[PDB]
Curated annotation (Swiss-Prot):
Co-factor(s): Cu(2+)
One Pfam family it belongs to: Kelch_1
Single annotated GO MF: galactose oxidase activity
Protein name, as recorded: Galactose oxidase
Activity-regulation annotation: Inhibited by diethyldithiocarbamate.
The protein's enzyme class: oxidoreductase
Cofactor binding comment, as recorded: Binds 1 Cu(2+) ion per subunit.
Organism in which the protein naturally occurs: Gibberella zeae (Wheat head blight fungus)
EC number(s) from the headed UniProt entry: 1.1.3.9
A cellular-component GO term for this protein: extracellular region
Disulphide bonds in the chain: C18-C27, C515-C518
Length: 639
């Protein structure tokens, strides 16, 4: 099922109002503690008024509210389930502001939840915008509101969490659809479970940042349960999703048509492998013993043009194996892969040993030295993160993780790896003094300004358990070689969580759980709004606008000219992201060297090396002197 982040507020002195209520199904039947009694909107002789329907609670005194729950009817009647919905909070009961949570609940009779950042409130309003299957009515057997033990105002300057997006699935895998700006998410054959899958089915959900709409789809056309996969956006602008619950399958998500297309089977059956897009737009993958068997799974490569997978048996997985106590099942998982120059793939970890993978002929692998610093050799860091925040300079920030996949203490270890040419051993140093909080199963994104946002995880890796959670995110700022704590959130984001950078410059962070009838499923996501979007008073800052681009599709080495509505100081390209199981091999950042044409006209060149400027979709951000980024302009980079 799921759970609230708080404890239930006693209701015996509550006053409640509903937009309509049938006799015998009064508004207060939803708070009488009786699972068999329910509130129901008008029907029959009273007519059948359609949604939106509304439930409003006066709790009389201020509570530190951090969620609510809805228990549906328990008599088998399915016609009043709440679909699309919004949650509002108020101190006076007249002014409600923006929803603290909104989204869509799955169509079944299970208890639904809305979890969100703690906010003092006396009044709580639930708006049922649709019934789950489009019927006129709304009903609730029991509604509860939850409180945190305390409330602390966010500190000025450290960003902001909210709102919550409520979802019909646990989003354990996600990607940005670059042509539409929507967030694509998926779970498995079920909304919150992967166990005992017959295969051939993936449940997906999407969220549109522009409209707030949550939608969902059942994908069977690719005959692929895409839980636990490799994910890469290839040079043809299609997301290549590999293996997992159906360990040999390849599915292709096409953003332009918003559809899924069958791909060729991989040569080797895999799950929990990483895949990485290459300089030529192809996709490399290696490892992945979670599914398809436990044995040495060497490299293979996908060609989007020929629609083939070809084995690269001499791209050996052995040199990148961790020393996981559980053995090969875990040790070849979630490699920190980055496409690089001349068809190569850099493997930065999680193993202590770093390696170069090559894709010519039948493949090759060469040692790149050990991840290390003057503090010593870095231990295996399974489910640590790796982020290429300056591709032009070859800079990769690595952090967190634990020596074993589970039942292992995470660390604060963090490094800067500086890539040169394939086959050379990169310089590695420690990043600052490491993380503030040791964490594994955390997630991260590079931001327009080159800083890396790091969020969630737990101190000791225990899949499906929300213990030792880390609620305070951190940002690494490369120019200062310093980490900074940001404002904390209140929802655990550990195993099976994701983060992605949105085109509007905010961070989408969600998921966690996906373990069936476990209590740790998180059917939601939250927005983190970084400090660079706020002015000194804590209000949203005015953002520079890109008013014209000379072109939206460019070959590597090509130039783009832009106009802005105000002077800008910096610009960057950020490749669109994909995410699952801590892995995001698609994001990376290119800082741009600007030519000032005068009159707020600027030009820049896309790097000529497609191992740096990986083909695919990128976000163009410009920043003003105050450090405020524009929203992204979408650029396609080709080779
Ligand atoms: Ca009841
Ligand atoms: Cu998993």
């Amino acid at each position: 099922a799921s759970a609230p982040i708080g404890s239930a507020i006693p209701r015996n002195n509550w006053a409640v109002t509903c937009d309509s209520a049938q006799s015998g199904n009064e508004c207060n039947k939803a708070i009488d503690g009786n699972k068999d009694t329910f509130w129901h909107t008008f029907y029959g002789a009273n007519g059948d008024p359609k949604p939106p329907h509304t439930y409003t609670i006066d709790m009389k005194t201020t509570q530190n509210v951090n969620g609510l729950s809805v228990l549906p009817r328990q008599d088998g009647n399915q016609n009043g389930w709440i679909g699309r919905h919004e949650v509002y909070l108020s101190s006076d009961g007249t002014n409600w502001g923006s929803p603290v949570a909104s989204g869509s609940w799955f169509a079944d009779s299970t208890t639904k939840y809305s979890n969100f950042e703690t906010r003092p409130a006396r009044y709580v309003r639930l708006v049922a915008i649709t019934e789950a299957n489009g019927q006129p009515w709304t009903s609730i057997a029991e509604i509860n509101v939850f409180q945190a033990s305390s409330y602390t105002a966010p500190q000025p300057g450290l960003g902001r969490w909210g709102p919550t997006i409520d979802l019909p699935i646990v989003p354990a895998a996600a990607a940005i659809e670059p042509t539409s700006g929507r967030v694509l998410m998926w779970s498995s054959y079920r909304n919150d479970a992967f166990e005992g899958s017959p295969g051939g089915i993936t449940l997906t959900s999407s969220w549109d940042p522009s409209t707030g709409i949550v939608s969902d789809r059942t994908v069977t056309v690719t005959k692929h349960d895409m839980f636990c996969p490799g994910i890469s956006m290839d040079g043809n602008g299609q997301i290549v999703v590999t293996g997992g619950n159906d360990a040999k399958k390849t599915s292709l998500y096409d953003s332009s048509s918003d559809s899924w297309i069958p791909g060729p089977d991989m040569q080797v059956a895999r799950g929990y492998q990483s895949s990485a897009t290459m300089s030529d737009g192809r996709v490399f993958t290696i490892g992945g013993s979670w599914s398809g068997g436990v044995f040495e799974k060497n490299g293979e490569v996908y060609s989007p043009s020929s629609k083939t997978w070809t084995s690269l048996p001499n791209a050996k997985v052995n040199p990148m194996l961790t020393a996981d106590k559980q053995g090969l099942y875990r040790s070849d998982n979630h490699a920190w892969l980055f496409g690089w120059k001349k068809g190569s793939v850099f493997q930065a970890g999680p193993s202590t040993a770093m390696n170069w993978y090559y894709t010519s002929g039948s493949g090759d692998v060469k040692s790149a030295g050990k991840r290390q610093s003057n503090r010593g050799v870095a231990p295996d860091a399974m489910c640590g993160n790796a982020v290429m925040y300056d591709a032009v300079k070859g800079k990769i920030l690595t952090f967190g993780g634990s020596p074993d996949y589970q039942d292992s203490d995470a660390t604060t270890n963090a490094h800067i790896i500086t890539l040169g040419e394939p086959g050379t051993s990169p310089n590695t140093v420690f990043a600052s003094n490491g993380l503030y909080f040791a964490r594994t199963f955390h997630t991260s994104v590079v931001l327009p300004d080159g800083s890396t946002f790091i969020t969630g995880g737990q101190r000791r890796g225990i899949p499906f358990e929300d213990s030792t959670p880390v609620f305070t995110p951190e940002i690494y700022v490369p120019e200062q070689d310093t980490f900074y704590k940001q404002n904390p959130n209140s929802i655990v984001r550990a195993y099976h969580s994701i983060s992605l950078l949105l085109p509007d410059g905010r961070v989408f962070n969600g998921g966690g759980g996906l373990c069936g009838d476990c209590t740790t499923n998180h059917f939601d996501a939250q927005i983190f709004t970084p400090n660079y979007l706020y002015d000194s008073n804590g209000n949203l800052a005015t953002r520079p606008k890109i008013t014209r681009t000379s072109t939206q599709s460019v070959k590597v080495g090509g130039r783009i000219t832009i106009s802005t509505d105000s002077s800008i100081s910096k610009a960057s390209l950020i490749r669109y992201g994909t995410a699952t199981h801590t892995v995001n091999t698609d994001q990376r950042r290119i800082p741009l060297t600007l030519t000032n044409n005068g009159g707020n006209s600027y030009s820049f060149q896309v790097p000529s090396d497609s191992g740096v400027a990986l083909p695919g979709y990128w976000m163009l951000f410009v920043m003003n002197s105050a450090g405020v980024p524009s929203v992204a302009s979408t650029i396609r980079v080709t080779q």
